């Protein structure tokens, strides 16, 4: 391989106008590339970006998000919307729980939040609540996670927390830390040749991310995606899924579907019995030697098993095929 000339782009001065607004200039660029990388970097920055956001909020004395609280000038929905634009910067985690306790007359900002050693708040002046009477007090638990690309609460119908207490209020997530992105070509006065351009990228974020990792991650995504454009083996999928269940599909379900007492559930969880496929082939002899399992628990098992048609202590030495 020995062809082409080409050049290479490099980072120059990152003019930080404010904590939210920034400027990233790329000088070493030609004419075609300088105007081509613009849209690529712009789109990847205006979407394919990480960042943190609030997902769940549990407040004391409040069940649903359509209720209110004594001494709070703002209703629950407004408080949730105020938690939507909460600038949070987590150090090295993917899920953090920020507790927020505050009482007495006055507005409750992001500064009233218990300052964690991992959580970095950009704007501690962010209005969250407005306590009126001096006897009023609020204590809420805020959950912040790290994601990408919106994803509201409507997406997760119930694919998280099989139980999930009533107190937990789900809130929409605005993961993308980048607000607006613009870029200008402009003729570059590079003290060298004459026909070069300097891709100036005007950026506006929330302050929860620096231009450095932002531009590098964006270009990293672009490179990783262009990686598949090298070789084209045209790899197909084997498919051909097997369609012949050798045993009853119910045996693939856990013991939680049996719907029994708590004690018996703890015994099965302590006896290494997760699915019903193991309990269905476990004799009463082994169940009698199980800690904290008497006549009531044993009768409970045989009743919740016989009701579903199945029995107790059978044999089906085909476990588990065959992935």
């Amino acid at each position: 391989g020995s062809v082409t000339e080409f050049l290479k782009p490099r980072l120059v001065d990152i003019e930080q106008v404010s904590s939210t607004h920034a400027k990233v200039t790329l000088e070493p660029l030609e004419r075609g590339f300088g105007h081509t990388l613009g849209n690529a970097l712009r789109r990847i920055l205006l979407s394919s970006m990480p960042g943190c956001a609030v997902t769940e909020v549990e407040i004391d004395g409040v069940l649903h998000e359509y209720s209110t609280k004594e001494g709070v000038q703002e209703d629950i929905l407004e408080i949730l919307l105020n938690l939507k634009g909460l600038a949070v910067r987590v150090q090295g985690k993917d899920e953090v729980i920020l507790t927020l306790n505050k009482s007495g007359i006055g507005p409750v900002t992001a500064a009233d939040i218990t300052h964690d050693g991992d959580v970095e708040i950009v704007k501690p002046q962010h209005v969250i609540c407005h306590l009126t009477d001096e006897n009023a007090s609020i204590s809420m638990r805020i959950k912040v996670q790290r994601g990408r690309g919106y994803v509201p609460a409507s997406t997760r119908i119930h694919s998280e927390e099989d139980e999930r207490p009533i107190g937990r209020l789900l809130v929409d997530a605005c993961y993308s830390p980048v607000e607006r992105i613009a870029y200008n070509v402009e003729a570059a006065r590079v003290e060298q040749r004459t026909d070069l351009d300097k891709l100036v990228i005007e950026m506006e974020t929330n302050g929860t991310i620096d231009p450095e990792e932002a531009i590098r991650r964006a270009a990293t995504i672009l490179a990783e995606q262009l990686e598949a454009f090298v070789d084209l083996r045209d790899v197909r999928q084997p498919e051909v899924k097997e369609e012949k269940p050798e045993f009853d599909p119910i045996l693939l379900r856990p013991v939680d579907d049996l719907e029994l007492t708590v004690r018996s559930a703890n015994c099965l969880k302590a006896e290494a019995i997760h699915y019903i496929g193991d309990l269905v082939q476990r004799t009463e002899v082994e169940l009698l030697k199980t800690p904290n399992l008497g006549k009531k628990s044993l009768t409970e098992i045989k009743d919740v098993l016989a009701s579903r048609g199945l029995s107790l202590g059978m044999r089906l030495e085909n476990w588990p095929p065959a992935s």
Partner: protein, 50 residues
Amino acid sequence: GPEEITADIPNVGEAALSKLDESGIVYIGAEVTGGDILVGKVTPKGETQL
């Protein structure tokens, strides 16, 4: 016969008590979706022959 509001609905699983109380009425503030039960109600009907 009369129809009663109970939680002892026939042909149900653990999803019953999941949203419904000991009586048969959904808790105030629970999240429900298309298919869930709000009020447990049963109607008497013998015969059926089978």
